[PDB]
Amino acid sequence: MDSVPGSLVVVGGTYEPWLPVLEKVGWRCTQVADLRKPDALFVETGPCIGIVDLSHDEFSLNGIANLVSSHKQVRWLAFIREAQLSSDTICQFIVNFCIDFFTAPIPDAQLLSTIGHQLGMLKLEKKVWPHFGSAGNMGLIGESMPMKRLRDQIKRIGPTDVSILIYGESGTGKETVAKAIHKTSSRAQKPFISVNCRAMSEKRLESELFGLGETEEGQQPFLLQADGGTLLLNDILTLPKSQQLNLLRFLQEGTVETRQGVRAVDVRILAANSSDIEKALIDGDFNEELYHYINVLRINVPSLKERASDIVLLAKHFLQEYSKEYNAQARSFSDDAVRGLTRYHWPGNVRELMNQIKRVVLMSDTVVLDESQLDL
């Protein structure tokens, strides 16, 4: 036979009754007491099933609900066991999903019925859980301390095919982030379309949602191509009213217009921002309904000003990359030069950095790059 382990947290060992009914029917039972232990146990066991002994007992109700959605999220299914207390706050605490509960006696055959419904999910969890982004894709442009948070954040919000708001300062790598969560999105093998729109006129911009290729003159709406995959919208607030309409229409109906008949698609939508969004909102300028459609999740891309310990490593890569790309003899920075570039403010962040270095490298006549050839 083949099955899946399952743990249970309780100080009262003698509270077996429901335990041997599962071991004999084939369940890998594990039991924790001291409250702090199961966290490590749950984070190491991976996807499983946990039973919560509520029978008055001795646990902090805050810490409980905390654990419930700490990192033990979808990968863990909630379930409680109580001594018949459905009345006060305690049963209102079953707002934490919990799927079902346990009568104080032993609903012998009913117990499997309660459990059996959920079992299809754990064997489903195992099919999707191994992934883990194995290759440790060290933020394909940066790697420091605020960055590791970003990875973890990106890794857990990636697969969730919801719309996410990406915000940070200009030239930080919001697009770089967008491309990264597309790999995580589980629609990774599908196309990805970043769009530095800006330099588009309404007519031409409007030509994206319903087209103005009069007669099939080699023209296809952008939304269409991004079907199954991911589309990115850059500098979004610059959008005109009429197009924001079509977006919300599309965001609600998922349909687009083509000359060869109106059609529907399946595109996960992302958005980037660097401006004071709230200031636009209050005046009336931005449709708030649309904001709630997109602000389902937020991710903040930290500027170079935030990280600073990244500045050195970034320059090295940008050195290596551009020097190798153009055969340049420049291969290293002096300790002098290193101990100066970080002090710069870098308003344009990642963008400006590569751009600046790009120039210096193509101007660099030496192998070691001094401060004289840089910020001048």
Ligand X SMILES: Nc1ncnc2c1ncn2[C@@H]1O[C@H](COP(=O)(O)OP(=O)(O)OP(=O)(O)O)[C@@H](O)[C@H]1O
Task: List binders of a second copy among 253-272 (CB under 8 A).
Answer: 253-254, 264-269
Nearer to ligand X, 7 or 274 (CB): 274
> What residues between 336 and 375 interact with ligand X by CB under 6 A?
351, 354
Q: Which listed residue (56, 204, 339, 345) binds a second copy by CB under 8 A? A: 345
Nearer to a second copy, 19 or 90 (CB): 90
> What residues between 152 and 171 interact with ligand X by CB under 6 A?
170-171
Q: Which listed residue (92, 201, 215, 260) binds a second copy by CB under 8 A? A: 92
What is the token pair recorded at 341?
């570039």
Please choose, from the candidates 88, 92, 112, the residue with its C-alpha nearest in 3D space to the C-alpha of residue 102: 112
Return d(Cα 326, Cα 200) in angstroms, integer. 33
Does 274 bind ligand X (CB under 6 A)? Our answer is yes
List the x/- string, 273-302, binding to a second copy by CB under 8 A. Answer: ---x-xx-xxxx---x---xx--xxxxx-x
**Residue 95 C-beta: closest distance to ligand X, Å:** 24
CA 310 to the chain's CA centroid: 22
Range 67-75 contact pairs with CB under 8 angstroms and sequence separation of 24 or more: 67/38, 67/39, 67/42, 68/96, 69/96, 70/39, 71/43, 72/42, 72/43, 73/156, 74/125, 75/46, 75/47, 75/125, 75/129
Chain position carrying tokens 């060869």: 260
Q: Which does 305 bind (CB under 5 to 8 A by kind): a second copy, ligand X, none?
A: a second copy
Strands 255-256 and 230-233: unpaired
Does 339 bind a second copy (CB under 8 A)? Our answer is no
Return d(Cα 7, Cα 229) in angstroms, integer. 38
Is the Cα torsion angle 78, 82, 84, 87 positive or negative in sign?
Answer: negative
Instruction: Return the range that interacts with ligand X (CB under 6 A); candidates 100-108, 130-138, 172-180, 258-266.
Output: 172-180
Q: At what angle do helices 37-45 and 61-68 cross, to 10 degrees?
A: 10
List the x/- string, 194-233, binding to ligand X by CB under 6 A. Answer: x-x-------------------------------------
Q: Which does 357 bind (CB under 5 to 8 A by kind): a second copy, ligand X, none?
A: none
Does 66 bind a second copy (CB under 8 A)? Our answer is yes
Query: Hey, what amino acid is at 160?
Result: T
Q: Which does 272 bind (CB under 5 to 8 A by kind): ligand X, a second copy, none?
A: ligand X
Q: Which listed residue (3, 238, 242, 252) binds a second copy by CB under 8 A? A: 252
274: helix, strand or coil: coil
DSSP state of 26: S
Q: Which does 335 bind (CB under 5 to 8 A by kind): ligand X, a second copy, none?
A: none
Please choose, from the candidates 257, 256, 260, 262, the residue with its C-alpha nearest in 3D space to the C-alpha of residue 215: 260
CA dihedral 341, 346, 348, 352 (to 10 degrees): -20
List the x/- string, 10-49, binding to a second copy by CB under 8 A. Answer: ------------------------xxx--x----------
Q: Which does 196 bind (CB under 5 to 8 A by kind): a second copy, ligand X, none?
A: ligand X
Q: Which listed residue (57, 235, 257, 352) binds ligand X by CB under 6 A? A: 235
**Residue 142 C-beta: closest distance to ligand X, Å:** 11
Q: Phi and psi dihedrals of 89, rounded to 5?
A: -60, -45
Residues found near ligand X in the complex (CB under 6 A): 170-176, 194, 196, 234-235, 272, 274, 351, 354
